[PDB]
C-alpha cells in the first residue's frame with residue numbers, strides 16, 4: 001500500500017483540461033499561441049488548487065506560497081505536457097485535443113523549446129515513468145524550485161524532505177530491482193529546470209503575460 | 225565491495241590555477257572579463273585532462289566526448305567557483321588571487337548571475353558539502369549534462385549510473401545519520417543548470433568565445 005503522500009497526490013491530481021482551439025480560425029502562429037494561453041490559464045487555476053493540497057503548502061505564508069509558484073509554475077505545466085506525451089512519438093500532448101508535431105512547433109516558433117521537452121519525454125520513456133512518480137516529481141519541482149525570497153527556510157526544506165522521502169519510499173516499495181531509481185528520477189530535474197527557464201524567458205520576450213503580472217494573477221487565485 | 229571511483233576522482237583533481245590579473249590596469253568592466261577569459265581558458269585545459277580520467281569517458285567517441293563537454297563546461301567552471309567560495313561570505317573566489325564581491329560584480333555586469341551562484345554557495349554551506357561530494361557532483365554534472373547530440377545513449381547512461389552509484393555508496397558509508405543525503409545532493413543540480421544556462425547565454429550575448437567556437441576549442445584540447 002502506497003505511502004499517504006503519494007496516494008494523496010494521486011487524489012489531488014486535477015482532471016483533464018482541454019485547449020479547445022477555435023475551429024473557425026485558420027491555423028497560424030497566433031492561433032497556436034492564443035490556444036496555449038487559453039489552456040495555460042485554465043491549467044494555472046487547477047495547479048494553484050493542487051498546490052494547496054500538497055501537505056505543508058497551505059500552512060506556509062502567502063509570501064512563501066507565492067515564491068514557490070512564481071518559481072515553479074512553468075516546470076509544472078511542462079512536466080504535465082511531458083507525462084501526457086509519453087505514449088506518443090515526436091509529438092507534444094498539450095491536451096487530448098491539442099497535439100503538436102514538429103511542423104506545428106516550427107509554425108508556433110517553439111521548435112528548439114519543444115525539442116528539449118521531447119528530450120525529457122525520451123528519457124522518461126526509457127525509465128518507464130509511472131503516474132505515481134510523475135505527481136511526486138511535480139510536487140518536488142514546486143518545493144525544490146530555488147526561489148530567492150523564502151521566509152521560512154526550515155518549512156520549505158521540510159517540505160522538500162517530505163516529498164523526497166515519499167519518492168524514496170515509493171521506489172523502495174515498488175522498484176526493488178533498481179535501488180537507484182529514486183536518484184535517477186531526481187537527475188531528470190535539471191533538464192526540466194533548463195527547458196522551463198528557456199520557456200519563461202520566451203514567455204516574457206513575446207509578452208504573453210498581457211496587462212496583468214503573473215504575481216498579481218497568483219495572488220488573485222491563491223486568495224480566492 | 226570497494227568502489228575506487230571517489231578515490232580516483234580525488235587523485236584526478238587539478239591543481240590551483242591563478243588569475244594573475246594585470247596590476248597596472250585600472251579596475252573596470254573590461255579588465256574583469258579579460259581576467260576571466262584568460263583564467264577560464266587555462267581552467268578548461270585541465271578540465272579536459274580531468275575528464276579523460278573519468279572512467280568510461282574516453283572510451284566514448286570523440287563526438288560524444290565533445291558533446292558532454294559542450295553541454296557541461298560552464299557547470300564545471302561554476303561548481304569550482306562555488307566550492308572555492310564556501311568559506312567566504314557574499315564573495316566568489318574564481319582563484320586565490322581573484323575574489324569578487326557584490327560591487328565588483330556590478331562593474332563586470334555579473335550581479336544577477338553571481339547572486340544565483342551565491343545561492344548555490346549558501347545551499348552547499350548548509351549541507352556542509354565535502355570534497356568527496358564536490359568532485360563526484362562535478363563528474364555527475366558532466367555525465368548528466370543532457371546534450372542533444374549523443375550517439376551512444378546507453379554508454380552515457382552507464383557512466384551516469386557508475387557515478388551516481390559512487391555518490392550513493394559514499395553517502396551510505398559516511399553519512400548514515402542522513403539516509404537521504406545523496407538525494408539532497410542531486411536536488412542541488414537544477415540550480416547549477418539554471419545558473420550555467422544563464423551564464424552561457426550571457427557568454428554568447430557579449431561574444432566572449434571570440435573567433436573560434438567552443439566545440440573547436442574542445443576538439444583542439446582533446447587531441448593534444
Ligand SMILES: CN(C)CCOc1ccc(/C(=C(/CCCO)c2ccccc2)c2ccc(O)cc2)cc1
Pocket residue numbers: 033036037038039040041043077078080081094110113114117199200202203208209210
Ligand atoms: C498570463 N496568462 C494570461 C497567459 C499564460 O501564458 C502562457 C502561455 C503559454 C504557455 C505554454 C507554452 C508552451 C511552452 C512549451 O512549448 C509557451 C510558453 C512560452 C511562450 C509560448 C508558449 C504552455 C505550456 C504548457 C501547457 O500545458 C500549456 C501552455 C504557458 C503560459
Ligand SMILES: CN(C)CCOc1ccc(/C(=C(/CCCO)c2ccccc2)c2ccc(O)cc2)cc1
Pocket residue numbers: 257260261262263264265267301302304305318334337338341423424426427432433434
Ligand atoms: C575562448 N575563451 C576566451 C572563452 C572564454 O570563456 C569564458 C569567459 C568567462 C567565463 C566566466 C564567467 C563568470 C561567470 C560567473 O560569474 C563569465 C561568463 C559569461 C560572461 C561573463 C563572465 C568564468 C566562470 C568560471 C570560472 O572559473 C572562470 C570564468 C567563462 C568562460
